[PDB]
Every structure is written in structure tokens, then in C-alpha cells.
Amino acid sequence: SEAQRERRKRILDATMAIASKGGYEAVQMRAVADRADVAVGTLYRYFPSKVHLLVSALGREFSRIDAKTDRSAVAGATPFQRLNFMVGKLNRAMQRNPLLTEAMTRAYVFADASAASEVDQVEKLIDSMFARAMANGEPTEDQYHIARVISDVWLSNLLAWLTRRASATDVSKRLDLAVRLLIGDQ
Amino acid sequence: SEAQRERRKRILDATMAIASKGGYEAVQMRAVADRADVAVGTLYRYFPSKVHLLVSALGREFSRIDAKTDRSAVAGATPFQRLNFMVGKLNRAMQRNPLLTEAMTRAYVFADASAASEVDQVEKLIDSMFARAMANGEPTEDQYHIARVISDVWLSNLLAWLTRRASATDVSKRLDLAVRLLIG
């Protein structure tokens, strides 16, 4: 179904635009439908809530970040260094558009069971991103486990930063500390 | 002093009953005041928002667990086992009323600066419970560092449980993994 793919791409694109410009509160169903030039019935049909839309957009965004991140700087680096590199990249992406980030994060954590599959797919993505950041070929099971913990730390610090409980420097320091707590102070 | 504590207690009790019935979106200041048998003005004097309400309630849950902690019961256990026990207790407390937990968590994760004092109190409490569990006593700074990571994992897995991405068993297993990776 190429039509469903084009419509999906549009919906997610408009969601990204609206969230980027106005934040979580700006992401309204009919607004997104209108910026993507779609009908509200079809949008509610494919995405039953703003949470679903924002989490899906988050999914494609993580996937594309992963598929577009130039890793030349850490060619020949150790897994520790490469992991810190990836964490740094995601932190930069976090601090890029704070309204977009607040929107997608808020959708992630305010999600309920109805969006589970979506959220899970995001979680699995970020884990993978960290695991493969450590790996030579396919990650070890422990690299996946380490990535799981790193993703939890990253989530919690993202929440602290969004609510202004922590500064960017606090986030970097805590993530770095977590990494050193998991794979030693290298 | 005593009357104030009575009112505060009644208020948090009402908050938890309402939240247990209908979650975050059901917690309205007026209804809390009503159930609590207090004027809304008095309530606002005690707690400026439903966020302060729910985070204060969460903090009281964790206080009440913390007060019941006796290490003479877990004397023959290892740091790993004591930490996994503590995780078990916190998880039990949260897995009782899913809507209540959802309310307290929702309020806790995105509370603003105005509630920053309560949030801190909850966070420092959880950390201190994990760290002390590691030390079976007053912890080193490093054990607090580790506790902070464990609390991050715990919180993430609470969200996973709430959204039914993970069963209670899955949560236990993932926390077990985290603890193993951090302190073996």
C-alpha cells in the first residue's frame, strides 16, 4: 500500500513540524491533519491520539538519526569511546529543539497501554543504537544489557533536563558517570 | 501541629483514594478538598496543585516503606540480594493500584520548578533506600552514584509496567540484570 505510506510520511512530517514550532500543546489532531492535508477520520484511524503520532515520529526520527550519524570521528576508537560518542550525539539531538524534544518525551512517558507497541519499538531502537555503538559486528548480549541501562539513564536525565532539574552539563556528567559505572573508568 | 498533620494526612488519603479510582486526570483539587472534608482554600494552603499533591503522596508512600525497613530480617543476605529485595518492595508498592501509581508517576516525571522541592525529596529518598540497601548501613558516595542509576532503571521499568510493555516478572528480571551489571 504505497498510498498508506505516502499518507503516513505526510502525517509524521506535519507532526514533526507542528511539534517543532509549538511544542506538545500545539500538537492537535486536526491541526496535524491540516498541515499534512489529510482528513481527521483517516488520521484518527491510523493514529488514535497525539501520543501515537508523536511516538511514531520519534521512532522514525531515531531510526533516521541512527542511519545518518556520521561515525568517522570514532573510527578506530574503543567501544567505550564510541559509546560516549553516541550518547553525546543523542544529547546534542536532545538539546537541538527543546520544544520538539519536550513534545516527544512527554508523549513517550505520558503514553498508556494503547501505544505500547509503538513505545516499545522506540525503546528497542535506542537500546540497539547504544549496543551497536559498542559492537564489533553484532552486539554481545551484555552489550544489549548495558545499552538497556544506558537508555534508562538517558531517559531519566532527559526528564531532569526538560523539567529544568538539571543543566546540560549535569546530564553529560551523569551519563558519563553511568557509562564509567558500567564498563569502568577508561 | 497535630491538627495540621491530621488535615494533611486526610488530604493525601483523599488524593490516593481518588487517584486509585481514576488516575491522574481524576484528581481535581475541589474533589480532593470535598473528600478530605476541608475548604479548598485550606487545601491550597497545604498544596498549591495536584502535582504537589501526587508527588507528596508518592513521597509519603516511600517514607512509609522506609520506616518499616529492618535489616535484621535481611541479615544473612548479600548486597545483591538486599538490593533486589528493596526493588521487590518498591515494585510491590507501585504494582498495587495501577491508576494511583500512574497518577503519582505522571506527576513526578514532569513536575515543574514549583514542585521541585517535593520531587527532590522523593528522588533522594529512593536513592537513599537503594544505596543503604547496598551498604546495609550508611553508604559511600559511590554507592549513591550506583543508586542513582538503579533508580533510573526502576523508573523506566515502572513506565514499562504501566504501559503493559513489561510484566512484573520482566521488570524484576531487568532490574536484576541492572544490579548484576553494576555491583555483581
Side-chain angles (χ1 to χ4, degrees), chain A residues 3 13-19 22-24 26-27 29 31-33 36 39 41 43-44 47-49 51-52 54-67 69 71-88 90-91 93-95 97-98 100-116 118-120 122-123 125-137 139-140 142-163 165-169 171-172 174-175 177-186, chain B residues 3 7-9 11-20 22-24 26-44 46-55 57-69 73-80 82-84 86-88 90-95 97-117 119-120 122-123 125-172 174-184:
Chain A
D13 289 334
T15 298
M16 289 293 302
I18 295 298
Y24 186 75
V27 182
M29 296 298 294
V32 171
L43 186 55
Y44 273 108
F47 302 90
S49 66
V51 165
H52 292 80
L54 281 171
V55 170
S56 290
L58 176 57
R60 53 142 42 167
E61 208 68 20
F62 270 150
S63 172
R64 291 175 172 180
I65 284 173
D66 183 37
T69 301
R71 297 167 177 80
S72 298
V74 281
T78 61
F80 170 86
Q81 292 162 351
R82 289 161 53 199
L83 177 57
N84 283 325
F85 178 85
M86 184 55 88
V87 176
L90 287 183
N91 284 2
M94 168 196 308
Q95 304 185 36
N97 192 326
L100 171 64
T101 296
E102 196 261 343
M104 298 180 308
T105 305
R106 217 173 188 99
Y108 191 93
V109 297
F110 276 58
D112 49 39
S114 63
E118 290 85 335
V119 169
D120 185 78
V122 172
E123 190 177 83
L125 270 175
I126 188 179
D127 290 356
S128 185
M129 209 174 312
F130 287 142
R132 290 181 284 114
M134 275 180 280
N136 289 84
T140 65
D142 275 10
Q143 279 167 347
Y144 275 111
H145 297 330
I146 286 160
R148 182 80 289 284
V149 177
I150 292 301
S151 291
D152 292 349
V153 173
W154 187 79
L155 173 59
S156 179
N157 280 269
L158 166 55
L159 291 173
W161 179 80
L162 277 183
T163 57
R165 255 159 255 170
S167 69
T169 293
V171 178
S172 78
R174 285 202 168 96
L175 262 302
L177 177 55
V179 169
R180 283 174 152 84
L181 286 178
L182 286 161
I183 59 181
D185 199 327
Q186 310 179 35
Chain B
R7 282 186 177 179
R8 182 189 172 93
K9 178 181 173 306
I11 290 174
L12 296 185
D13 288 351
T15 300
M16 294 180 58
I18 293 185
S20 288
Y24 186 91
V27 179
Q28 295 287 285
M29 300 289 289
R30 176 183 176 177
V32 172
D34 193 347
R35 199 177 190 283
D37 192 76
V38 295
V40 184
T42 308
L43 169 57
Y44 265 102
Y46 281 57
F47 310 86
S49 67
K50 61 182 296 178
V51 175
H52 293 70
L53 231 48
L54 288 164
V55 178
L58 180 55
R60 190 181 72 169
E61 288 299 273
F62 290 165
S63 291
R64 288 186 179 177
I65 296 179
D66 191 53
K68 201 64 178 174
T69 287
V74 288
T78 139
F80 185 88
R82 298 193 304 266
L83 200 47
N84 284 269
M86 190 61 256
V87 169
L90 290 190
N91 285 351
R92 171 215 282 159
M94 297 297 103
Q95 289 165 17
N97 296 282
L99 293 178
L100 169 66
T101 301
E102 190 168 56
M104 296 186 297
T105 303
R106 199 153 289 187
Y108 173 72
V109 292
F110 261 106
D112 69 282
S114 67
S117 186
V119 171
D120 180 87
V122 172
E123 187 173 44
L125 187 45
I126 312 168
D127 282 12
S128 81
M129 291 173 76
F130 284 143
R132 275 184 281 107
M134 273 176 261
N136 214 16
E138 288 306 322
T140 72
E141 189 198 21
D142 286 326
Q143 287 170 323
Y144 278 114
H145 286 330
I146 293 168
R148 181 81 284 274
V149 179
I150 300 164
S151 293
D152 297 344
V153 178
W154 177 87
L155 193 256
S156 177
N157 275 271
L158 188 53
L159 298 175
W161 179 81
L162 287 162
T163 55
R164 302 184 218 159
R165 287 180 276 132
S167 70
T169 300
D170 301 335
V171 167
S172 304
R174 282 191 160 187
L175 267 300
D176 186 83
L177 276 170
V179 175
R180 251 175 180 96
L181 294 177
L182 292 164
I183 72 171

